[PDB]
Design an enzyme around this catalytic site. Sequence first.
Site, mmCIF file in Angstrom:
data_model
loop_
_atom_site.group_PDB
_atom_site.id
_atom_site.type_symbol
_atom_site.label_atom_id
_atom_site.label_comp_id
_atom_site.label_asym_id
_atom_site.label_seq_id
_atom_site.Cartn_x
_atom_site.Cartn_y
_atom_site.Cartn_z
ATOM 1 N N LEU A 232 -1.540 1.343 6.521
ATOM 2 C CA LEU A 232 -0.987 1.259 5.204
ATOM 3 C C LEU A 232 0.085 0.268 5.146
ATOM 4 C CD1 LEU A 232 -1.298 4.793 4.791
ATOM 5 C CD2 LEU A 232 -1.994 3.061 3.007
ATOM 6 N N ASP A 233 -0.056 -0.665 4.228
ATOM 7 C CA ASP A 233 0.922 -1.744 3.987
ATOM 8 C C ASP A 233 1.223 -2.047 2.504
ATOM 9 O OD1 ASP A 233 2.719 -3.637 4.422
ATOM 10 O OD2 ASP A 233 1.294 -5.178 5.062
ATOM 11 N N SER A 234 2.462 -1.758 2.106
ATOM 12 C CA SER A 234 2.928 -1.834 0.717
ATOM 13 C C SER A 234 3.383 -3.254 0.412
ATOM 14 C CB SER A 234 4.110 -0.890 0.535
ATOM 15 O OG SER A 234 5.087 -1.122 1.567
ATOM 16 N N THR B 285 1.525 -5.865 1.263
ATOM 17 C CA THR B 285 0.315 -6.630 1.109
ATOM 18 C C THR B 285 -0.474 -6.213 -0.090
ATOM 19 O OG1 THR B 285 0.177 -6.527 3.512
ATOM 20 C CG2 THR B 285 -1.705 -7.425 2.235
#
Lengths: 6, 6, 323, 323
Positions: free
Chosen positions: D210-212, D214
């Site tokens: 999970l990457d906020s 990107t």
Amino acid sequence: XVVXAX
Amino acid sequence: XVVXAX
Amino acid sequence: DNVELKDLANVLSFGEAKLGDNGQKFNFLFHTASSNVWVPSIKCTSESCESKNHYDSSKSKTYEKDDTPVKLTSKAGTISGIFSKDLVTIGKLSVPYKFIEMTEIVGFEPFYSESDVDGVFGLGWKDLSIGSIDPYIVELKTQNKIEQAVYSIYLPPENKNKGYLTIGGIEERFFDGPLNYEKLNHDLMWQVDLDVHFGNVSSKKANVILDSATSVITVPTEFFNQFVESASVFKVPFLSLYVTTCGNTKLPTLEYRSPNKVYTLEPKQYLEPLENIFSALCMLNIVPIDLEKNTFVLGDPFMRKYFTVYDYDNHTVGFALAK
Amino acid sequence: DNVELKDLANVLSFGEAKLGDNGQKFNFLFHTASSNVWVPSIKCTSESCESKNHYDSSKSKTYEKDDTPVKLTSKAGTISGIFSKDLVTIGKLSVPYKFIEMTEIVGFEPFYSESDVDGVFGLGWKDLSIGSIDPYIVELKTQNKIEQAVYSIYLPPENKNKGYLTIGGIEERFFDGPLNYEKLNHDLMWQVDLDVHFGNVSSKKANVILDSATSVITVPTEFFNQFVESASVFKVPFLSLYVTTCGNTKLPTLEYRSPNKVYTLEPKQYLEPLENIFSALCMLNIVPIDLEKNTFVLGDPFMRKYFTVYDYDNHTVGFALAK
């Protein structure tokens, strides 16, 4: 985009 | 796109 | 004599040039607006240096050491290395040249590493030149290996064949009609003072620059917005991409006017289709930008119609159509 | 308690956070995959620092000096500054915090300067943490100002209202159905080992993150090409943008499967129209990328459906739909 003067 | 892990 | 250019990413200006007394090949971007030429060092310690072509000072015995540090902090990001001297070869031309041994770049990604380009070949002016060195091009008449200090860039008008860069004479096989010189308004870059119209919008005596490094025609921002507002066009939301029909009438001809001959760009020339073949949809090659005062910029799409020539011996620029 | 997120450039994760014992406001990117939080210094001497919000160590009397140099050489480009300690405030929360006083960035343009974001708020892990410091989030249960070490990110499913980030408890007003924890396979980032399908293509036990930070869903390259080849789609030629119909059937659901509950993304969710309203044409939010081994990434579009929660106290991650 490729922009190269400032 | 804005990609931020390598 | 001639050099072959190939397409990179709709910037058809890469070419081969050689360093040293053996074959040290580098994919070169022949920049018109940058001054000093630079190369990725074998001792370059940066992340993207991995796959790009390397200069090994030591295997080439012409290496005239300078080994003084250079801080090339560009507009995008930062290139730093160490000056080096050696023979620089284009085709039949080779000479004593002070260039940059690059060890470290930062901000030039994401664009650098994906492309094939290795090196930036500066083709510019002395004032832009830190190290206060005359440019390759100038140090060839200075040190006779060719006659007159002049270069021409040929990009084929159907974006399919090979493109060329010549140095020596105006190679007449390229252009079409009379060739037009124009008068530089700076000794800094290949820029000239022109009047330029799109819609009703016009910006009288606005300074413009030929740039082979840049893949779009540039226009000041408020130039842009003034036709564009009603010139129904769209976006990749808060990311610089702009769009309309390929079948578009409303669209003006980029008019670039001067007391000699006007240089016009037709809608059909600053638009590129998107759905590949048989597409409804096109992206302008025009991005709005205030580099400086009333500064427009002419990049690839321009060169893609008008054949351009660049004259140190005359402080003049070549302008004609292409074959 | 809650924080308000706004949209930046189809990455709706910016928020406000404060430094020091007066009101020192910074537009923050709440990164899930970065560890240390950092801020633009008043003494930041870089080109883009011009317009971004500044930290003045001196006007805030809590400044616990560290003043030791940090070399944050990221994937894009380079951030370097000097460690500093002070109170860091989100809403009702303020605490003793070791962060980065940034003086110099390079390679993070062209994206940084255009956006409103000022600072990167690291929300990650200790191993990723240079300085070997526990994260904000962890130093609040450690130093009681809230109860349990957990954050939740809410992005509204019609991309129109306000988004939230909470820290305290699971705020039930957000999700829908049961909430699902999953089991981290690294103590490095919020990643987990999942099976993931699109076409016939599947990559069993592939690590995902999970990457906020990107704004697209990422997929290994050869994953990509395998459906995509016949999955007629197009490009902005040798520049990473990809395209097809908004009215597209051929298109699969992003299936992200686990021994508990599957997380699916429908075509309608990883496509964005281009001609604004009433458009034929859409861009996937999927870019092909090998970060590492069998590594997929889930960025904004994901969070834009599934409400996510992040549990240090359980090494668990929140997964449910949104209100």
